[PDB]
Amino acid sequence: GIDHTSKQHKRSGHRTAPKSDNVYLKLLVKLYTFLARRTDAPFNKVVLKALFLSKINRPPVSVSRIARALKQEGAANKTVVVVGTVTDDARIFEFPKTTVAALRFTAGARAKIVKAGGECITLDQLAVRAPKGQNTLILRGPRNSREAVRHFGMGPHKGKAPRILSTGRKFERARGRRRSKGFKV
Amino acid sequence: MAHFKEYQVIGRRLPTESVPEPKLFRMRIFASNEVIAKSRYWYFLQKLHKVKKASGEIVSINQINEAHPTKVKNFGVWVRYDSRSGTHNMYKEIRDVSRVAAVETLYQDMAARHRARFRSIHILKVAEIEKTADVKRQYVKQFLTKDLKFPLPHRVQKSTKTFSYKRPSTFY
Amino acid sequence: GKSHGYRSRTRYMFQRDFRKHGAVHLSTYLKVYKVGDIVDIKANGSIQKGMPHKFYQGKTGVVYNVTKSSVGVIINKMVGNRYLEKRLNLRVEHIKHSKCRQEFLERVKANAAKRAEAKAQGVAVQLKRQPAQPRESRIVSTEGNVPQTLAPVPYETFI
Amino acid sequence: QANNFLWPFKLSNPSGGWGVPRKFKHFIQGGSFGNREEFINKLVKSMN
Amino acid sequence: AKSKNHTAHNQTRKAHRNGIKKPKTYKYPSLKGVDPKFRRNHKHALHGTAKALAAAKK
RNA sequence: GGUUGCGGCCAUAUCUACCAGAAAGCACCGUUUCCCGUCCGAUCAACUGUAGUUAAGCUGGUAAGAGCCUGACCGAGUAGUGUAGUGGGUGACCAUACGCGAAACUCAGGUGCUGCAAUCU
RNA sequence: GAGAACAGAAAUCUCCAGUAGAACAAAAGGGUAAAAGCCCCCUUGAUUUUGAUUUUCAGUGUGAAUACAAACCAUGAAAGU
RNA sequence: GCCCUGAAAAUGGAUGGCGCUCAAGCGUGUUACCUAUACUCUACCGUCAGGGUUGAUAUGAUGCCCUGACGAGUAGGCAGG
RNA sequence: AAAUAUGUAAGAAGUCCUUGUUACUUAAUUGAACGUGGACAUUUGAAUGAAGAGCUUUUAGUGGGCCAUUUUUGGUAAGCAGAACUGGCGAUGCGGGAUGAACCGAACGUAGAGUUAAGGUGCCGGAAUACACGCUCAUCAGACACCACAAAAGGUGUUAG
RNA sequence: GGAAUACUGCCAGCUGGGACUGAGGACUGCGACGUAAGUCAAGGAUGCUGGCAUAAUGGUUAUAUGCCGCCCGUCUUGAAA
RNA sequence: GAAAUUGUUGAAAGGGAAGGGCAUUUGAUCAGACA
Ligand SMILES: [Mg+2]
Ligand SMILES: [Mg+2]
Ligand SMILES: [Mg+2]
Ligand SMILES: [Mg+2]
Ligand SMILES: [Mg+2]
Ligand SMILES: [Mg+2]
Ligand SMILES: [Mg+2]
Ligand SMILES: [Mg+2]
Ligand SMILES: [Mg+2]
Ligand SMILES: [Mg+2]
Ligand SMILES: [Mg+2]
Ligand SMILES: [Mg+2]
Ligand SMILES: [Mg+2]
Ligand SMILES: [Mg+2]
Ligand SMILES: [Mg+2]
Ligand SMILES: [Mg+2]
Ligand SMILES: [Mg+2]
Ligand SMILES: [Mg+2]
Ligand SMILES: [Mg+2]
Ligand SMILES: [Mg+2]
Ligand SMILES: [Mg+2]
Ligand SMILES: [Mg+2]
Ligand SMILES: [Mg+2]
Ligand SMILES: [Mg+2]
Ligand SMILES: [Mg+2]
Ligand SMILES: [Mg+2]
Ligand SMILES: [Mg+2]
Ligand SMILES: [Mg+2]
Ligand SMILES: [Mg+2]
Ligand SMILES: [Mg+2]
Ligand SMILES: [Mg+2]
Ligand SMILES: [Mg+2]
Ligand SMILES: [Mg+2]
Ligand SMILES: [Mg+2]
Ligand SMILES: [Mg+2]
Ligand SMILES: [Mg+2]
Ligand SMILES: [Mg+2]
Ligand SMILES: [Mg+2]
Ligand SMILES: [Mg+2]
Ligand SMILES: [Mg+2]
Ligand SMILES: [Mg+2]
Ligand SMILES: [Mg+2]
Ligand SMILES: [Mg+2]
Ligand SMILES: [Mg+2]
Ligand SMILES: [Mg+2]
Ligand SMILES: [Mg+2]
Ligand SMILES: [Mg+2]
Ligand SMILES: [Mg+2]
Ligand SMILES: [Mg+2]
Ligand SMILES: [Mg+2]
Ligand SMILES: [Mg+2]
Ligand SMILES: [Mg+2]
Ligand SMILES: [Mg+2]
Ligand SMILES: [Mg+2]
Ligand SMILES: [Mg+2]
Ligand SMILES: [Mg+2]
Ligand SMILES: [Mg+2]
Ligand SMILES: [Mg+2]
Ligand SMILES: [Mg+2]
Ligand SMILES: [Mg+2]
Ligand SMILES: [Mg+2]
Ligand SMILES: [Mg+2]
Ligand SMILES: [Mg+2]
Ligand SMILES: [Mg+2]
Ligand SMILES: [Mg+2]
Ligand SMILES: [Mg+2]
């Protein structure tokens, strides 16, 4: 036998295709695992993985988060890639030109982009123009802005929000939530 | 412990700045191999001086061969041993043809008569009893009487097949 | 039934060192601490205020704070299968600067030297540490020192 | 680097046997374990 | 019926599966419970130097 | 080198007996109007530095001195101890193998080192 | 220990030795000598505000405790506490 | 040291049984020999891992090809059927 | 005053120079903290290993334990009761100890060839009625760890001292 | 004085007997021998010969024989109980 | 028109249970492949 020093038959724990069942998604993956095998360009390698990402690890990048990234020094002409949906954002009043390459554009976003005379490209059109991902600026959305993660790590002195249905005074604000009622948190 | 060789072992207290060239001690050691021999050396040495292997060095190991390996000899043997209930000095006499044969059967004898295993025995001295009549134990003296002869009565020949067609005979 | 108060089990831990009771000598107070200093901890039983708990006796930690009569020491204490961060408010009588680093610091200062001393000569350095190598060959002489031969000794009783 | 490159050798049990009737005492005590010095080649060869 | 009272048996086996995690270290730890007089000044200090490294890019 | 004032390490500085100490300094020492404290100007306060003394303090040296400090293959690789065996022994216990290793003992050497400022034949 | 009328084993007075062999509410163990013990003097910080920390720990609560911040005070020539 | 005495229990009975006495017993040594799901080499299965391969004009891209290591299992989890 | 255990440290989050910030702090631009600018690369600072490392969520069963060596408390003691560290059994078959949860050896995919472990080799039964030196004769001999018990005390039996 | 020999160790010295295996399926590599052309035991067996062409080999089955094998389910520290 | 369970017929085995595992003999029985 072998004094093992490591758990045997361990799965690497990384998605290795998407769990998604979409033809088109699978084709984009067909495209990119080819590019990733034959182009030593790191970008293709990153994109291939992002396609496997479940909906949660794909938060929506906004058009305003897009516009900001372009105010990066020396970055205003880059084509931003977003492996996920791209949402609109009325809060920005002035939007740049550029070229966003993404999985989905909401109606409002694709308009705002095109209204200022930009381009909305699908990832495969992106490939044909930038097979080594040249001149691309990859953005990801806020993963930990999810409502769920509020409640992660709930316990004393952690400050994390009860899993609670109804809220108001007299919903979990008394004994153990204030010095004058037993104790606090 | 097996079939012994005799070794001169030499060791000496690892040198130091204020004492380069420490003093060098020798032991003759009956062991079956040089590895056991070096062990035994350190064993008795820490029983005599302030050293241990850690802080000391074996300097030279050499097998000593019998001087006259086909000369019959009367060996006086001195031993320290542990019994179940105490420890005991003791003198035996062994007749053989080399100090190495002699120590083989001593260990044999000590084991057979006193139930002494190797761990529990200490050779004090083995030396050739030169002049007969300084031989003291009878079971040896017996074999010095002039013109010695004896029969070897009741001969048992080993059969090589299971069955025999004769009925044997122990004439000899 | 059982008892488990704060200084329980500490009879000889906090106890005072033979012939060394009394005032603490003044240098214990002239010593000076800054954040990041590594300190070893040992309780002075004569100083009851601001005293480490026994678990931190014998323990080494890093300074994180300095107050009028005290320093704050962080220690990692492992509770469970995990360490947690502990902050200790100690009075200066229970802390001393650690030497646990003096060999490092001395070695860096020197490693910087042997390097400059090398570099601006013609390289060849070798300044990592190395374990005890086994020793080399050697010729021991007999001249003045022939081997003395010992044997083992008989049983005796002196008593 | 040279020695780590070498994957741990995998010997068979000794052909001649072990010497000894019990392995788990020290060489010096008639056993098999420990430093047995130059007698390591006799063994390893019988297992290689 | 009485029953066992206490043991540590098997407890370090358990602690070692996932293994006594080394304590984890950060550059820039927290000032938690650091002297407030110090911390108050430290504030206005950092304000100033920041401002003087905004001056640097005027 | 001495001595003072403030020290650091806090007996190689402590303890017992005895002798020696130039110069300066400390000291003992004189006084009771004043601030001040006492049963008591002994302590403590003040005033003189004058009227006196090395007696004590202090400093140093002596002692097969007590103590304390150091060292050593002195005792001892001893006691004890991590590790091994389908080792011994009815047991109590004990050897052995690879390691770590005391304390007492005994013998020798020692008996304050030193920082800042002032002062001194 | 040695000394002083009544005065004795033990009253009160003095000197010498005294590493704590005493005392410090209480159990016991730590600790302490120009004090932490004994006598005296002045006092209320045993107060106000709200956090951090250590023990027990789930790193919850409670008890107890620690070092600071912001007050107002006490004492002391003062450093301080 | 071995042996003997010290040495008393209940159905007939256990060095495992037979039986063994210069042992087939006790102490010790030296060889050889027997045989585990263990070790070495090899085939096949499965698991995990690392490579390679969309180029049409034929058949699985969850595919095809190369290479390496690993395989006990209650309660229990998950997976492919 | 040990041995075994035990805290920290062995660098880029490092070392050195220059001299900014503040309401803290100093007699003092003195310090303290945080910085800007500059000097030095993998012998960049011990060993060995590393089927990589870090991180997050959620949930089962479990919450009667028992054994062995060593340390160890109560008890005359217990196949008794209670702790310490590890290794086990529980959850596990395989070879050995005739037998047997826990001892020894060794941990398991389906198989061939080899070699071994622990344990054996008169016959049961694979394997020397092998070699070698002693010892032992029992009118209740003895015969292999855990283990299935024997003691004080004696023998002019015999052995060696 | 001069040899031998034992013992231990080395040889990329030669050489006999015996057993199991023969995965892979054009070529591709690293080589070896040769003046050369070639050849080879160098990234996994081929050559030659015979017998049968069927219950012969093989499967299934019943029996016999060697060694082995306790009744499952369960609760339990522990069940063939 | 299953099973437990039964009668008959045929074949086998059986010294205090039977059934099971590895393996082969023996009987019975059978697929494939040859060309
Ligand atoms: Mg929100
Ligand atoms: Mg509270
Ligand atoms: Mg000779
Ligand atoms: Mg108690
Ligand atoms: Mg004192
Ligand atoms: Mg208090
Ligand atoms: Mg061989
Ligand atoms: Mg063989
Ligand atoms: Mg052979
Ligand atoms: Mg054996
Ligand atoms: Mg081989
Ligand atoms: Mg109950
Ligand atoms: Mg119970
Ligand atoms: Mg319980
Ligand atoms: Mg004078
Ligand atoms: Mg008056
Ligand atoms: Mg006066
Ligand atoms: Mg005065
Ligand atoms: Mg005088
Ligand atoms: Mg004086
Ligand atoms: Mg003296
Ligand atoms: Mg030990
Ligand atoms: Mg073992
Ligand atoms: Mg034992
Ligand atoms: Mg002893
Ligand atoms: Mg008390
Ligand atoms: Mg005082
Ligand atoms: Mg109160
Ligand atoms: Mg509660
Ligand atoms: Mg029996
Ligand atoms: Mg038998
Ligand atoms: Mg025998
Ligand atoms: Mg197998
Ligand atoms: Mg294999
Ligand atoms: Mg499995
Ligand atoms: Mg497993
Ligand atoms: Mg350690
Ligand atoms: Mg490595
Ligand atoms: Mg790796
Ligand atoms: Mg859970
Ligand atoms: Mg749970
Ligand atoms: Mg639960
Ligand atoms: Mg339960
Ligand atoms: Mg065990
Ligand atoms: Mg259970
Ligand atoms: Mg098992
Ligand atoms: Mg078995
Ligand atoms: Mg048995
Ligand atoms: Mg039989
Ligand atoms: Mg046989
Ligand atoms: Mg033979
Ligand atoms: Mg025994
Ligand atoms: Mg007897
Ligand atoms: Mg006798
Ligand atoms: Mg083939
Ligand atoms: Mg083939
Ligand atoms: Mg035919
Ligand atoms: Mg046919
Ligand atoms: Mg035929
Ligand atoms: Mg059948
Ligand atoms: Mg059976
Ligand atoms: Mg049940
Ligand atoms: Mg029960
Ligand atoms: Mg009908
Ligand atoms: Mg039939
Ligand atoms: Mg069959």
Q: Look up residue C26 and give its DSSP letter.
A: T
Ligand 4 centre from B19 Cα, in Å?
Answer: 56
| C81 to E32: CB separation less than 8 angstroms, yes or no | no
Are the C-beta atoms of C71 and C63 separated by less than 8 Å?
yes
Q: HSE of E6 in the Cβ direction (CA atoms, 13 Å)? A: 0
Of all helices (H) and strands (E), which one includes residue D4?
helix D2-5
Can you state the percent helix, strand and coil of chain E, rounding each to 5? 45, 0, 50
Ligand 1 centre from A79 Cα, in Å?
Answer: 30
Which residues get their CB within 7 angstroms of nucleic chain F?
B 13, 19, 22, 39-40, 42-43, 46-55, 82, 84, 115, 117, 119-120; C 19, 25-28; D 22, 24-26, 28-29, 34
Which nucleotides in chain H have some atom under 7 angstroms from a protein Cβ? 1-2, 22, 26-33, 38-41, 47-50, 52-55, 61-62, 70-72
Q: Look up residue A97 and give its DSSP letter.
A: -
Cα separation, A104 vs A98, whole angstroms: 17
What is the longest distance spanned by two Cα atoms in chain C?
75
| Cross-chain CB nearest to E19 (options C64, C81, C87) | C81
Structural tokens at position C143: 């001249």
Are the C-beta atoms of B58 and B29 separated by less than 8 Å?
no
First to last CA, chain A: 52
Cα separation, C70 vs C62, whole angstroms: 14
Chain C residues at the E interface, defined by Cβ less than 8 Å, are: 64-67, 72, 76, 78, 80-83, 85, 87
Neighbours of chain C (3+ CB pairs under 8 A): B, E
Q: Identify all chain B residues contacting D30, using CB atoms and an 8 Å cutoff.
A: 1
How far is C-alpha E23 from the geometric centre of its chain's CA atoms?
10
The distance of C23 to chain B (nearest Cα, Å) reads: 43
Q: Identify all chain B residues contacting C151, using CB atoms and an 8 Å cutoff.
A: 27-28, 44, 123-125
Resolution in A: 3.0
- For A143, residues 6+ apart whose C-beta sits below 8 A from its C-beta are A56, A57, A59
Residue listed under structure tokens 């948190």: A185
Cα separation, D11 vs D43, whole angstroms: 10
| Cross-chain CB nearest to C82 (options E20, E34, E35) | E20
Of all helices (H) and strands (E), which one includes residue C97?
strand C95-97
Residue listed under structure tokens 């043809």: B97
Say whether the CB atom of B172 is under 7 angstroms from strand H. no
Q: Identify all chain B residues contacting D39, using CB atoms and an 8 Å cutoff.
A: 33, 35
| E19 to C66: CB separation less than 8 angstroms, yes or no | no
Of all helices (H) and strands (E), which one includes residue C144?
none
Domains in chain B, CATH or no CATH each: 3-69 (3.10.20.10), 70-146 (3.10.20.10)
DSSP A114-183: HHTT-EEEEHHHHHHH-TT-TTEEE----GGGSSGGGGTT-STTT------SS-STTSS-STBBSTTSS-
Sheet architecture: strand order including C38-41: C83-91, C70-78, C60-66, C38-41, C95-97
Of all helices (H) and strands (E), which one includes residue C35?
none
> Among candidates A174, A177, A79, which has minimal Cα distance to A133?
A79
Task: Dihedral sign for Cα B126, B128, B131, B132, please.
Answer: positive
Query: What does R_g of chain B's alpha carbons equal in angstroms?
Result: 22
Q: Look up residue C56 and give its DSSP letter.
A: G
Cα separation, A77 vs A86, whole angstroms: 19
DSSP bridge partners of B96 = B73
Cα separation, A89 vs A68, whole angstroms: 12
Q: Look up residue B111 and give its DSSP letter.
A: H
